[PDB]
Symmetry: C3
Amino acid sequence: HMIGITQAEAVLTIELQRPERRNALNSQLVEELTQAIRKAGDGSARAIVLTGQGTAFCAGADLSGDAFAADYPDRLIELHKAMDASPMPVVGAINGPAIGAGLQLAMQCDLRVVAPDAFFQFPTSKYGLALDNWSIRRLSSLVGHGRARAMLLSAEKLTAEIALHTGMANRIGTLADAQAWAAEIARLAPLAIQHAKRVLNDDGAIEEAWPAHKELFDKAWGSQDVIEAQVARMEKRPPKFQGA
Amino acid sequence: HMIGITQAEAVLTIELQRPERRNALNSQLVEELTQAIRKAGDGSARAIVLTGQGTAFCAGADLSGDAFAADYPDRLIELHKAMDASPMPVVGAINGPAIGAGLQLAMQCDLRVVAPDAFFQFPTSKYGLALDNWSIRRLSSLVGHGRARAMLLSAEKLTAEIALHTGMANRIGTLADAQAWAAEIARLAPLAIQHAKRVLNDDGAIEEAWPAHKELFDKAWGSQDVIEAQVARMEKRPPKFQGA
Amino acid sequence: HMIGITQAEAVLTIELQRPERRNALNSQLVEELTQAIRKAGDGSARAIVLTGQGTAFCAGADLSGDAFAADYPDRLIELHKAMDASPMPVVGAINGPAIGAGLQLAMQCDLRVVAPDAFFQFPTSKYGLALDNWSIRRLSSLVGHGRARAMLLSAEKLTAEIALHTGMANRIGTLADAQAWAAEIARLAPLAIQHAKRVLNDDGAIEEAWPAHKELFDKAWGSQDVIEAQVARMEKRPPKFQGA
Ligand SMILES: CCc1ccc([C@H]2C[C@@H](C(F)(F)F)n3ncc(C(=O)NCc4ccc5c(c4)OCO5)c3N2)cc1
Ligand SMILES: CCc1ccc([C@H]2C[C@@H](C(F)(F)F)n3ncc(C(=O)NCc4ccc5c(c4)OCO5)c3N2)cc1
Ligand SMILES: CCc1ccc([C@H]2C[C@@H](C(F)(F)F)n3ncc(C(=O)NCc4ccc5c(c4)OCO5)c3N2)cc1
């Protein structure tokens, strides 16, 4: 009910379909993507393309209304496991902005074809929040350590031009471009692709948070600044953080 | 009988001399390269330039009509060991294409001066094969993870301009260019260079394969798809891989 | 006495004020720096800008006239610990060349805004010296492994232009630019920044040197070539290294 699924030749295209919220994730959306990724190759498909409907790829996470929001973080982890564990290459057609949870998602794709007006952002420094280590490690691997510092420490937007520069984007193109490419890849030797993907993903980025990292994480998440940042956002005013 | 070794100033130039197979590696050539790396600086030389004769640096591996062809994987590991252990900086003059084993050898150099019309490639995904972890890790560090994903998951070529971009190439230039640069390096303090090499090479790229990596590596190498890739090539036709 | 410290808005600007020596790091300047960083946030400041007076950011370590040389490394280390431990983002306003220790100090900043005439260099291979692992890892993460090899193995200069390209420079700008950016960062949630800073700094660059690394490190440092570099410099001539 919240995603689209079409197959052409050997390419499964999975389309996020919640444009009314710029494809922000929730319990139901996340759980359907998961079933969809798991059930691909069932199936003569040999490559997956992932994309958003409308103007965004995925603008983050919106749990308003969501009855199982408590379950969301767990379902989200399952979704990333499901992708990571997939023997099928996932080609992200990043049709528009990919922010926060959406950025994580885009980064969990195996390759990325980015629309010219797309951008990537972790606005965590604006919301007093904190990321898991993987998000940071993978981000670093894709934009270089230096830019990752700017992105995490100052909510810097990574434009499409620069994503291509750093390697975040493999290509600047459209959904069609990404489907063409996915079809080439569908004709390649699956086991070779299975191997490379497993090793690539095992580059270290999947890291358990050090003891001090969990501290700072929890401290950030339980802070009053977290509440201040939301009220500010809602009021369309600058936030006045207290560092607590 | 299969390579050329000349020395000028304090620069040893080792040339692969099998242009009739585009300098494709085999038992003998690997053995002779190993010897030449070790016997280097015996000898007053403080720097090595490694290059290929003809249009290509090294197009892959051959073995066709190769008497001691079974201990070739072994002799190739010896070569990489020798190069990694040489107290001498090795400047690769990548005069042309560097593919598969050729790309490995190119990466095992300490510096790279790339000709405009050279490209690098791991076509393992087109042939149903799997690489060793180091090939993957070093590649990632030289082209960036993002671009490494494209080269490995879809057999994408790395052109010279892009090599310069990411740092795979330090310079775009000729053999002569590389040799002149090597002469400068020959006048720097050996012990400084020797320390830096060891540490740089010890960045973790030299990684034992995880269980899952050995398993997938082995499935691929013993797969039917490997035969299918070759017979399809021999029949000048699209391969139809089973994933097995 | 040796650094200037001002605060505007919520930004602490610390200026290295030894331009007569191109801001090279002497035992005392190091301590004053260390103290200034620790004592920051004491303090309504939420961000630090670290810059140099005159034409150079920092031309390296001093030691000339130092009656207590042996203690110098421990002070330089202390300074890095202080920066690494600071909950405050340090934006380096790299107003000119950052060489050796200068480059280390620039790399321990959290973000770098670089002047168009500036450049970064480890001329260690010109002096028979060797670096600690962190300098090597962090450098590789900032300019890419390929360019890290060139810089370390041949003393290659990283221009502002290419620092921007690789991520070593987040921006090309003036001190004032760096200060405007810092002011912004100062209005972001500190706890978010503190977390990302810790995790980022814990990417592995902070590495205990391996047995072989110490061995080579000591070997270079204790070498005769180290003296020869100093002598040739003074005698205004090309060094003549021996590898011992
Ligand atoms: C196995 C493949 C894989 C699995 C999960 C991830 C990421 C995904 C990503 C998200 F779901 F948000 F997108 N994500 N988010 C949270 C986690 C995650 O790993 N959470 C567990 C956790 C517990 C305590 C912590 C902590 C993390 O950080 C500091 O203290 C986590 N892990 C990334 C890759
Ligand atoms: C110590 C310096 C050094 C030594 C060797 C290498 C690479 C070279 C590169 C090549 F020889 F092909 F060029 N290469 N190829 C194979 C190996 C290699 O290390 N092979 C052993 C091995 C056994 C089982 C495996 C496995 C690897 O991968 C998954 O399952 C290997 N090691 C790279 C660096
Ligand atoms: C915890 C944050 C942090 C602390 C220190 C460093 C760097 C700084 C950098 C400098 F101070 F020069 F700028 N630096 N210099 C020396 C050290 C340093 O760590 N020295 C200890 C050491 C002992 C024996 C060794 C060895 C290192 O390398 C090979 O053999 C060292 N550590 C880098 C990051």
